[PDB]
Design a protein around this ligand. Structure first.
Ligand SMILES: CC(C)[C@H](NS(=O)(=O)c1ccc2c(c1)sc1ccccc12)C(=O)O
Ligand SMILES: [Zn+2]
Ligand SMILES: [Zn+2]
Length: 165
């Protein structure tokens, strides 16, 4: 009762497209796109895939930020608890996930880093289950650092390598 698995854009588990039809009026909107472009790269760097964003149309997964609530989902509980969410990516209005802005963000980091989190969120995208504790970017602030200082560990590399490149 869920075998359904369609896809409009280049969907083949190999290439995943991401589109941001919205951001949030509080910080450089470009800093939200740039880091997302540098984030999807972290994966291509260690994978022979190709993730690209279309200027307009339908993308494998739609990203949208908001605060308080946004119709979809049972609405965020507020600041705390969860920091992000991700629904089964593959169904029509399913991949079009949304990020919880109910918290205080800052491109300068400090609070909740969206960059480090970026690579984490994508982890679920590639149906990547969770590990035990291999100091993976999953761990809370495994390596809290700027976006240009972002670096993976040999342990986090032992998880993805499971694909053999
Ligand atoms: C959605 C939720 C159940 C869970 N994610 S989480 O617990 O919200 C979760 C897990 C990892 C990280 C954050 C939030 S915030 C952050 C900053 C830097 C690096 C890592 C992370 C999940 O992995 O599915
Ligand atoms: Zn949402
Ligand atoms: Zn995770």
């Amino acid at each position: 009762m869920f075998r359904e698995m369609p896809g409009g854009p280049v969907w083949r588990k190999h290439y995943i497209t991401y589109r941001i039809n919205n951001y949030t009026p509080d910080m450089n909107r470009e800093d939200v796109d740039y880091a997302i472009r540098k984030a999807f790269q972290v994966w291509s760097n260690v994978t022979p895939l190709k993730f690209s964003k279309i200027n307009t149309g339908m993308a494998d997964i739609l990203v949208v930020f908001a605060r308080g609530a946004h119709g979809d989902f049972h609405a965020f509980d507020g600041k705390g608890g969860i920091l992000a969410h991700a629904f089964g990516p593959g169904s029509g209005i399913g991949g079009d996930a949304h990020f919880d802005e109910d918290e205080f963000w800052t491109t300068h980091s400090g609070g909740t880093n969206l960059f480090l989190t970026a690579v984490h969120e994508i982890g679920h995208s590639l149906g990547l289950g969770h590990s035990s504790d291999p100091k993976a970017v999953m761990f809370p602030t495994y390596k809290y650092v700027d976006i240009n200082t972002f670096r993976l560990s040999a342990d986090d590399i032992r998880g993805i390598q499971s694909l053999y490149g």
